[PDB]
Structure formats: C-alpha cells, structure tokens
Amino acid sequence: TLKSFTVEKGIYQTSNFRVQPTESIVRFPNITNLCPFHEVFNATTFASVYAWNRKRISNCVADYSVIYNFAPFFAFKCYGVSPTKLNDLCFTNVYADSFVIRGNEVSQIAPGQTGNIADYNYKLPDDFTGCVIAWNSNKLDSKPSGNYNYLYRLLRKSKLKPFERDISTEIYQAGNKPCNGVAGPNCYSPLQSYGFRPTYGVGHQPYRVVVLSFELLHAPATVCGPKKSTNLVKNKCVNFNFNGLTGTGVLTESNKKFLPFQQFGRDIADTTDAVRDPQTLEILDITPCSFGGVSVITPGTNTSNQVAVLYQGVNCTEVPVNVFQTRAGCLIGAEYVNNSYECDIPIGAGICASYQTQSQSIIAYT
Amino acid sequence: MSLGAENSVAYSNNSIAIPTNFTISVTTEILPVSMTKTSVDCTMYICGDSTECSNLLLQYGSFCTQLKRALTGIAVEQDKNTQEVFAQVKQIYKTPPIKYFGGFNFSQILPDPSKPSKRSFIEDLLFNKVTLADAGFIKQYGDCLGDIAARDLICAQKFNGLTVLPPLLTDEMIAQYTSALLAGTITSGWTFGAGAALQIPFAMQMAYRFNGIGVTQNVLYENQKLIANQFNSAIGKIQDSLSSTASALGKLQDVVNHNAQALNTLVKQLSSKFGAISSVLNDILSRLDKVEAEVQIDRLITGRLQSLQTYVTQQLIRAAEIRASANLAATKMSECVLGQSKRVDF
Amino acid sequence: STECSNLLLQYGSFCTQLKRALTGIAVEQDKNTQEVFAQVKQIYKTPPIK
Amino acid sequence: AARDLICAQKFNGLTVLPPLLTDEMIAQYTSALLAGTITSGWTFGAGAALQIPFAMQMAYRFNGIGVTQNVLYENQKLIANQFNSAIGKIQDSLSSTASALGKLQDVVNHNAQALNTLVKQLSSKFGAISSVLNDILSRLDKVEAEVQIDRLITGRLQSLQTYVTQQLIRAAEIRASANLAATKMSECVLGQSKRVDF
Amino acid sequence: IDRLITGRLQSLQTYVTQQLIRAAEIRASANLAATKMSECVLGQSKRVDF
Amino acid sequence: RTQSYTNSFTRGVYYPDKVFRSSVLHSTQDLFLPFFSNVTWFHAIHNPALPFNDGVYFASTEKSNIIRGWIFGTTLDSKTQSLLIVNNATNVVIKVCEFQFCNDPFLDVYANNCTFEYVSQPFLMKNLREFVFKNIDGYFKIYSKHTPINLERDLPQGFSALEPLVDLPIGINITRFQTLLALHAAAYYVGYLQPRTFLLKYNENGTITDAVDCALDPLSETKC
C-alpha cells in the first residue's frame, strides 16, 4: 500500500476489516395460490381504448417464465424492472390492462409521452414501474370492412389522466352554438371508430397491448413470487430478506414501541434500523456486524521485519476478519510494560510503541 | 448604531494628569487549538460492501488515496498543534505543600486531588461549560453492538464508514502540563523558561514585575495587602462570571458544532438520488439489468464522490484556520506566561 | 423554471452549504473591520486650539 | 446608455451586501484614534486618557529610543520643520503616482472578475444543445429536455462550487491581513514598538 | 471523449485547489521567516522563545 | 343548510408515511390542512354536493352517531360509476357502482359489472371525530383519530395526530361528496386540503407532538 520495498519507522493505515456473514435469512410470504395468464393474454375480444378491463391481481404466486409461450411479443418490454428478476423481487399489487391501438401508437404506452393515446386515452404515468406487452394483431381481431368494436375518441376537451377511465358516449363540441347531434357544421363525430382492416399500411395496423403494472410500495406483504422461503436465526451477523429489504447485520431485542400501522425503520441516511417480522410478529432491531480500521505498527525494514497490528475502535473480542486493550482499539504483537519513556511511535490516547532490547521485541507503554 | 460616548480631553500647553492609585484587573482570553480528527473509508461510504460498485469505482483512478492522505495529514497536524501549544516545559514542576505566596489566593487555579482527573475549579467549570457533541473517539462499537434505546447520531455516523480517532494526549496529561506551567510561574518566575528554575519569593517577583512596567518597586511593598485583595477579588469575579454566564466559550462551541454538522451533512448526502431511480444500491442492483444498473451506480458514485471531495476541502480550510489559531495560542503561551510582554494589547 | 427546480432538488443539500459558506464569509468581513478599527471605548475629540 | 455589468450581475441571481460600518463611522473611529494619540499619548490605550503637552510626549518617545530628552528640547524647531516637510511630501507622492494602492486595487479587481467569470459561465452549453433553458423546454419532450437540464445543472453547480471555494481561500488571506492590521493598530498607534522593521 | 474530459478536468481542478492551500501555508511560513530575519538578525529581541 | 364560519385552530395533521421514526425532525412535501384556515360549521337542517378539491378534512362532533355514511362521484346522476360508502352497523359496505335514488339519496332505513366490494370492522371506532380523506394515484386514503375533548362549542385547541386505518385501491375520478342524512339537529365540520411543506416533531415514540405551518408567517419560515 506504500508501493515500495522498504518502509520507514512509524504507524501506517493499510486496509479495513469486515466480518463475513455465515448464512442467510429468507422470510418470503407463503401464498398457496397461482394466477392464470390464459385468461388475460388470449381473450376472444380484449377491449376498446376506454373499455380496458382492470384485472387487479393479488394473492397468487406468479410464474414469469411461461409468458413467452403465449401471443408473440418480440420482447417483454418493461420499464423499471428487468424481465428475469421478477422471480425473486416481488411487488405489492399488479393491475392488468388491455387495449387495441394502431401501429404508430405503441410509443405512447411508454412512461412520458404526448400524442393521441397519451392525451385522449389511457396515458401511462411518467413514474411507471411495470411491463407493457404489445404485438401486431392482424390474425384474430382484424375482422374486415372495419372492426368498429375497437372505437376511439379522436378529439377530447381535457387531458385523460392515468387511471381516469372515460366510458362516456356523450358529445364534445365547441365554438359557436349548441349542437344536439347535427353532424355537419358544429356537432362533429363524437366517438368514432378505428376501422381495422387488413388493407391498411403496417404503420396503421391494429396492435393488441397488454399492460401489467408491477408497482412498488411499503404496504403490508401482499402478492409475491415463487421463491423458496427459509427459517430464522438471530443474534449473529447474517444476511436477511425481511419482506423486500435486504442486507446484513445483527438482530437484537428491541425497546421501541412501534405504532400498529408503522412497519419499516428508515434512518437519517435512509437505511433500515428497526423492521417488523412478517410472519411471527416481533418488531426487532437491525445493527450491522463488526468492522473497523486496521493499522500496522513497524520499525524500519533495515532494523527488523516484526510488526504490531492495531485494530482501530473495537472491543478486542470480535477481532477476526499478545493482546492489549487500548482506548484507540486493541493491539496485537506488542507487550505492555509498566514503564514510561519518550513517545517513539504514536498509537492512541497516551499509548506509544517502540523497538527496545527488553531479546528484541515491540513494546507498548504510556 | 452608536460608536461610543463622546469625550473631550482637556489638552493644554502646560497641563498634565498623573494617576494616584491603581486597580489590578484579570481578564480572560479563549483560543482554539485542535479540532476533531476523522478518517473516512471510501468503499463503505460510496458502495457499502457491494462488489459491483467496487468494480465500477476502481475505474475512477486514485481519488480515494489522496482523500485518505489529506485526512491523515489533518489528523497528524492536530496532534502537532496540541503538542506545540502545551508541551513547552521540560520538567513537571510541583508546588510546595505550604500554600502561602505573599497573600495571593491561587487555590482556584491550582489542582486538587479530590477528583481522579486532577483539574482545578476553573478548569472544571470550563470543561462543564462546553456541551460536547457525540464525538465517538472512545470504544463506540461496544455501545452499538446491541441496538438499545433509540437511534443515536455517532452510531449512524460510524455505520457508514466515518471514524473519529482519539487525540494523542489525554485531558489529564494536558492538565498535568498546565499544572507544571503554573508551578513554574508561581515559584520561579520567568527564569524557568530560559534555563534552570531559580526560586524567588512571590513578593519580590511581583516587585520585579512592577519594576518592568515603569513603577518603582517600593509601591508594591507599601501596598501589598491591597494588591493581594484586588487580585483575590478579581479571581472571584472571574469564577462568578463563569458560573453565571454560559456564553463566553463560543469559539470552542463553534469548533464542536462545525465538525458535528459537517459529518451530519456527509451522512445526509447518502439519501439523495443524484438523478438515479433509487438511493439504495440493492434496489438498483436487483431491479435492473447489467447496463442500466451500471448507469445508475455510476450516477450514485459520481454524487457521493463529489460530496466526499467537498467535505475534504472544507476540512482542509478549517484545519488551516485552526493551525493559525494554534500558532497564535503557542506564541501567547510563550510570551505572556513564560515572561513579561511589552507589546500593548497583547 | 419549475422543472429545473424539481431536477435540482434531487441533488441533495449542496445549495444549503454553499449559502452557509458565503454567509460565514460575509459575517467574517464585518468582524475583520470591527476588530481592526473599533479599538477605542470613547470617541475622543481634538481641542479647538491647534 | 447600455446594459451595465452590475445590472446583469444583479439580474443573474447575485446580490452584493453593504458593509455594517459606513465610511463616515470608519472616519470617526480614525479621527478618535488620532485625537487620542495626539493629546494623551499612549495612555488612552492602557486605561483613561491622561493629557500631556506634545513636546513632553515627544521627549518620552525620544527617551524610549536611547536618545536623552535634552536633544529634543534644544532642537524642537528642527524636528518640527522636518516633520512638516515629511508630511508635506506625502501629498506630493500620492497626488501624482497612482501605483501605491495596488493592494486595495487588487482587492477590488479580484472580486469584480470573479463575478464576471461566474456570470460568463451561464452562456456555456456543457454538452447540451443550447445554453438557454426556455429553448430546451419549448423545443423537446419530457425525457430529452430532462437530459439537457441535468447537463446544465451539473455544469452550473460545478461553476458555483468553484466560485465558493475560491472565495473561501481569498477570505482566509484577507483575514490574515486583517489580523496583521489589527496588531499594527494595537502596537504602533496605541504605543511604541521596539521590534525592528515593525 | 466527454467522459474522459470530465475526469481529467476534475483531476486538474483538484490539483489546483491543493496547490492553492499549500501556497497559503508556505506564504504564512515565509511571512514568519521574514519577521524572524527582521527581528533576530537585524536587531535584538526581547520576546521569550522567539 | 346553515353556514356558520370558524377557524381551524392548529389541527389537521396526519402521519404521511407508514415508516417509524423517533426523536427526529422531518419535513414532508404533502397535502396537509393549513393552520388557522377557514372551515365551515355546517348545520344540516334544510343540500347540493360540495366539490372534492384535493382532499377533505371532514369532521363531526356528534355523540349519537347521526353522521353515518358518505357518497362520492363525478356527476352522481346515475351516469358515472361513482362511489358508495355504507357504514352498515358493525360493518362497512363499499360499492364502486351506484343506485342513485335522487340527488340526495336518503336510503330507506326505517349493477352493470361492479368491480370491487369490501367488508371489514365498523368504521366509527367529549368527542371530536376526525376523518381526513384524499385521493392520490387512484388510492382512497382514510385517516382517523378518536379525540376525547372537553369543549362543545367549536373546534378545540391543542394538538393530536391522525392515524391511517383502511386503504382502498379504487375510486378513479371523484370531484363531489356528500354526507349521509338517513333518518330513522346535526353538525359536520369540513375543510379543504392544499399542498404544504410541514415540518414534524417526533417524541421518544412515533407520536407527532408539535408541527409548524411552514408558510403561515415568517417566524415559521425561519423555523423551517
């Protein structure tokens, strides 16, 4: 760490030591239910742009590997999560949405966009955590002479916000007069149809879109995945998987009176300090296992190759990554004498070290 | 605002004014010497035992080596400042057991063995006046091995890679140095700062001190009891003013407070996103694929590295200011205490 | 600009410490002038005769 | 006329605060110090001001050098005329040459050019497509304008941090010079100094 | 190239800041040395341990 | 009805997130009730639907549980899906669809593909009953606090915190609301929420003891 073959007399800081965890704690939920994707990916007719059936999905183990056997999407186009990590990362509530739009309208089902579907139909939010599945659909829902069952508002007065379903068959008109259905000059086409035909260009062909919103919250432990849960250990440095948060540390007895709705333990530095057990309700505490700095005390290499090691700021019983306890840590390799000399190598709060003849050895004194 | 009272001194061609009496007044001056020594680990602060973050941090070169070098230089400089101010005497002088120094009461500045850390009355008042911060320069992890009571501030500071080193000289050694300086100054005079300590009675030493400022030494010997009473009343007035008012040690209080709030801001900088999608590294690592999580981790690494460089630069500037004040305090200890000074307002 | 402010809010507390540093410099300048010039308890006046 | 530098510096978000003590109060403090050191000598800095004739103060100040006081009183017209010529030389040296006050000129110039550079830093693109923010908001969609805004924010934050660090270093230098000036006001004006070249 | 430019600019700015702080320390030491040359060499000093 | 007017008197706060903290001071960008605002003392004796602007403070001092249920909807004329909240004795009945007898329902206590239904514990629990309602991201949050008091003339002073009880994931679009007046006088307090930047003080437990309205006066701006 000094990039040299000869070190001089003094005290040097070299690295840091950290104790490694033994095993892991996995306490995933236990839901003995599964959800069928067959009733959401190949229904006979899906929806219009505003008739999108909100299939709210909760309390079922979801297998995310068999989705590729369904209708041919090119890629599992997600925003925020990668489509191989859903088997272990788990969410709180999944909403299923489905609508049929044009070819040059799929780009508005991205988080943050403007256009016609992004303004007059179901607009995805800018902070959207989920997956959108879309494909070309001139095989099933492409009945000729205009498929008028999938019919859309071309013009709308106001912005249609996310989760603001508008099933109104009413009229929008503006500018001079009340209209009451006079289609020519004033009371134009209220809610027209797409006219899905196979004679259209590929930029305007019908496209079926399936939207799954894998949202994230600090809510109580609802719907999760197929990860195999394990048992519990305590009072030692192990990894944990308490609900969704993970890390390492030592779990001790608590004396903080949590309110019955409060669960998590976020700190000043936005780390978790005291979190609730998901199954056997005991609201314990989190503290990380032992670490600190390590420093090497040596004379010159032209004198000797002996060293003394100072583990800074630990009680000297949790040492592994002569024994003397110091206010600045604990010292290994130096014998404490009941004498007093001038300070040669400074260590800590009044303790120094030197290389004296009292057999040559490294001694520590006040 | 008012600059002061208007005064018009009666100057004339042959008029002079000469004092006929005197007052002995003892003032107080407070000077900082050293601040808190800190050391910061880069890997636990920026990354927090993540291998992927360490691999992306290895490409940034050697910023952390020079950050550690700057912090170690500041930490050595603090011990040098304390040793330069206090450790000026060669031998630890001791006061004789008979406490008679011509009628002057030194019982509030001389130590007493009633308490384990042998400090005087005024030193005890000064140590109790500064409300210290957390400042975990002791074996702090023994208290945080078991999470008890509520969340502390030094403990969350420690858990993110920030470590406070203890000072080289303890408080009782500084009190021993101060007691040696008092025992030299009362007994020997200015002779112990120029060679061997030569004893002299305190009345004859104070006669030398009056002879140094242009007053004839017979004024002391004819007014010894009055001067001793004035000195005792001034010492009691300083003791009462320190016991009553708690707003005189503001420089040392600011020395504590600045190093508290710099570490608090360095801890609070970990909660920011810096343009990424999460402030927690594990959520970024578990949610996304390789390339996007590398982009988010690069954003977090740049933000945390910028905050750490800002902290190190602020510590270097404060260390320069503290070193200037420590040099001033060393000069004042060398000139006011170990001798008599002719520099006015010094 | 509202969008720039919402993007700047994600950068932490750099603005607060920059403002604190400049406030410290601004107070220190007045401390320097006061400790250099204001060295008299009373404002003395020269006699009318010169 | 035209747009001033100070108007643009004000408009960009930078404000210059006035000092607490106006120049009239500084002049009052200086005149009080001069009146004290003319009438009373050094006695106004050690307690109450005690009046004394100026020839007696000059005799004491010769006697502190190593020259006896009979040298003054037998030569008082010569010291008076030499001091009059020496103080009349100062206005001749200062009414024509303008290079003596270069330290105060540098104190003004550095704090002008730092604000000039920090204002000039606002026209840089820092890798974006335009330095004007409203063009970015009116020209692009949400995500791309957010990318350009992040680039501009990083550049302007770096410029502000560089300005603050340079001001901190200059404040340390100015404080060291102010401490030296306070020591010189204490020791040269309020008394007599035996220190050589001080 | 923009990434490399940002990294090298940051390293150069860090070097300039450390050189400025070192220059301030060296200037304080040089002022002390000039005072000691003016007082110890050019005269006799009454200040203790100066 | 009768529109008597009074003041807020330093109440209307709630826990913003379900995260425990203690002995810390925290600042939240949320939609709290402003301090010393203009609330209305409604006496229901003679009633169109009041607007739902970003949240309702809704409160009642009724001992005998006259105020029972609530209705929500955009048009509320059997044209939109709307919402129905029924506190049926020791149960809660929530319907996302509508029946719409008339403009004021007056259910006689003497549906086109409904989506969500709900049942739970009774909704209600010297009495100051407080429900803060809001609708953010399609979620209908419910806050509650049982407040024993000693003043029965207006809103009493002091400080108390409102705890969340039941969370709903549905509601879509709500811009009108109306209390229930089913007969088998009355008084209900209503206030309007606005976005604020409150700073909260936590005790040794997770109890909000004091708070400051950060835009009420320059002293509170200094405290922020």
Ligand SMILES: *[C@@H]1O[C@H](CO)[C@@H](O[C@@H]2O[C@H](CO)[C@@H](O)[C@H](O)[C@H]2NC(C)=O)[C@H](O)[C@H]1NC(C)=O
């Ligand atoms: C010089 O001053 C001292 C006090 O500053 C004077 O001592 C006081 O004398 C009066 C009576 O003369 C007593 O009532 C006080 O108690 C004394 N004070 C102290 C502290 O001893 C002293 O008399 C003055 N001498 C002259 C010549 O004026």
Ligand SMILES: *[C@@H]1O[C@H](CO)[C@@H](O)[C@H](O)[C@H]1NC(C)=O
């Ligand atoms: C999961 O375990 C808890 C208790 O350990 C039990 O109450 C619950 O019914 C279990 N869930 C299922 C789906 O069996």
Ligand SMILES: *[C@@H]1O[C@H](CO)[C@@H](O)[C@H](O)[C@H]1NC(C)=O
């Ligand atoms: C989905 O259902 C339709 C009709 O029920 C069927 O034709 C189609 O093959 C199904 N999809 C798959 C992938 O089998």
Ligand SMILES: *[C@@H]1O[C@H](CO)[C@@H](O)[C@H](O)[C@H]1NC(C)=O
């Ligand atoms: C921590 O160190 C102290 C000091 O020796 C000791 O008394 C105490 O037992 C230690 N704690 C342990 C070993 O848990």
Ligand SMILES: *[C@@H]1O[C@H](CO)[C@@H](O)[C@H](O)[C@H]1NC(C)=O
């Ligand atoms: C000296 O002062 C006195 C009193 O003001 C005055 O009468 C006298 O004329 C002065 N001496 C001279 C030479 O002016």
Ligand SMILES: *[C@@H]1O[C@H](CO)[C@@H](O)[C@H](O)[C@H]1NC(C)=O
């Ligand atoms: C002054 O000295 C006497 C000893 O003669 C001592 O008893 C007394 O306590 C001293 N005064 C103070 C304030 O300590």
Ligand SMILES: *[C@@H]1O[C@H](CO)[C@@H](O)[C@H](O)[C@H]1NC(C)=O
């Ligand atoms: C509330 O609004 C009414 C409207 O006229 C007004 O008279 C009353 O003073 C207001 N109350 C306040 C501001 O406390």
Ligand SMILES: *[C@@H]1O[C@H](CO)[C@@H](O)[C@H](O)[C@H]1NC(C)=O
């Ligand atoms: C915190 O909770 C405990 C246990 O209920 C209680 O004894 C204590 O008084 C509470 N402290 C408060 C409310 O400040």
